[PDB]
Amino acid sequence: QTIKDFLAVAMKKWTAPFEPFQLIDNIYYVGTDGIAVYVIKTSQGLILMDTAMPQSTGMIKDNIAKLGFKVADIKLILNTHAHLDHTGGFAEIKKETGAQLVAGERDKPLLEGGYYPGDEKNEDLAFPAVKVDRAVKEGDRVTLGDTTLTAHATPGHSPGCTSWEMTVKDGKEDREVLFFCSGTVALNRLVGQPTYAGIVDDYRATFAKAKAMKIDVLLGPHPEVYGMQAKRAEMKDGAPNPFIKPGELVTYATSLSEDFDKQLAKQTAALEKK
Ligand SMILES: [O-]
Ligand SMILES: [Zn+2]
Numbered sequence: 001q002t003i004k005d006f007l008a009v010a011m012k013k014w015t016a017p018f019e020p021f022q023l024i025d026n027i028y029y030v031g032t033d034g035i036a037v038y039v040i041k042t043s044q045g046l047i048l049m050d051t052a053m054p055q056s057t058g059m060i061k062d063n064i065a066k067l068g069f070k071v072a073d074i075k076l077i078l079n080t081h082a083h084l085d086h087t088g089g090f091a092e093i094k095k096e097t098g099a100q101l102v103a104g105e106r107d108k109p110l111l112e113g114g115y116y117p118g119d120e121k122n123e124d125l126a127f128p129a130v131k132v133d134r135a136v137k138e139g140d141r142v143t144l145g146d147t148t149l150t151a152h153a154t155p156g157h158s159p160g161c162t163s164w165e166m167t168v169k170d171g172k173e174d175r176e177v178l179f180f181c182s183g184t185v186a187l188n189r190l191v192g193q194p195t196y197a198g199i200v201d202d203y204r205a206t207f208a209k210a211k212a213m214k215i216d217v218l219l220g221p222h223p224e225v226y227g228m229q230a231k232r233a234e235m236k237d238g239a240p241n242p243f244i245k246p247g248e249l250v251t252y253a254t255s256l257s258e259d260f261d262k263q264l265a266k267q268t269a270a271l272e273k274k
């Protein structure tokens with residue numbers, strides 16, 4: 001991977017439009033064609049799950065409005081993980097709304113510094129710094145009105161990467177949703193000068209944890225995590241919700257683990273003196 005390529009994709013594909021929609025029950029998609037952002041409607045206001053690139057905050061706000069939700073009604077902002085493609089609008093929306101920001105405790109320094117871990121001088125991976133109001137750990141519960149999410153610590157992609165679980169209805173029945181935080185290697189260094197200490201063990205633990213979770217609906221911070229666009233095209237009133245696929249996290253985590261092994265081998269070979 002190259003950082004140039006990460007930036008090129010972030011500026012073409014990840015800033016492109018996608019029409020917002022009700023995904024399941026009180027969870028709404030308001031992201032772009034390449035970065036997933038969600039509104040969760042509660043009885044006491046809105047929870048915003050992530051933002052997008054720093055230059056895309058206006059478009060996220062416009063997507064929220066296309067559903068009839070008010071940006072002013074956002075009470076809580078939750079983060080999956082603290083990289084600029086998910087945190088770019090946090091400072092802006094927090095200031096405009098007075099919302100509180102909730103994030104995994106080990107990502108707090110990243111959020112509060114606005115920098116990429118292990119590459120802290122790289123201005124093109126920086127974002128507007130934002131204060132964390134509540135730092136969460138495994139099992140912590142976050143409630144707004146009628147709605148509660150549970151934090152799961154799923155580190156690797158970032159040290160504080162937090163996957164968020166909540167219950168929704170599909171007709172009369174409960175379904176369990178996971179906003180999975182990301183388990184890609186992406187720009188991280190695994191060996192040599194690792195991006196952070198213990199990164200390899202964190203990824204390992206996260207893949208295993210993901211395969212053991214009982215989850216009906218897999219979501220994530222990029223639509224490619226769960227094949228959003230193909231599912232969206234299959235939505236029809238009266239037909240089963242295509243976002244319900246309870247085996248998907250096991251399949252996806254298996255794919256992530258296999259790619260992880262490839263990247264670890266590649267980076268290990270690249271360390272050899274030549
Ligand atoms: O990311
Ligand atoms: Zn990331």
Ligand SMILES: [Zn+2]
Pocket residue numbers: 083085086182221222
């Ligand atoms: Zn990302």
Ligand SMILES: [Zn+2]
Pocket residue numbers: 138139151152153
């Ligand atoms: Zn857990």
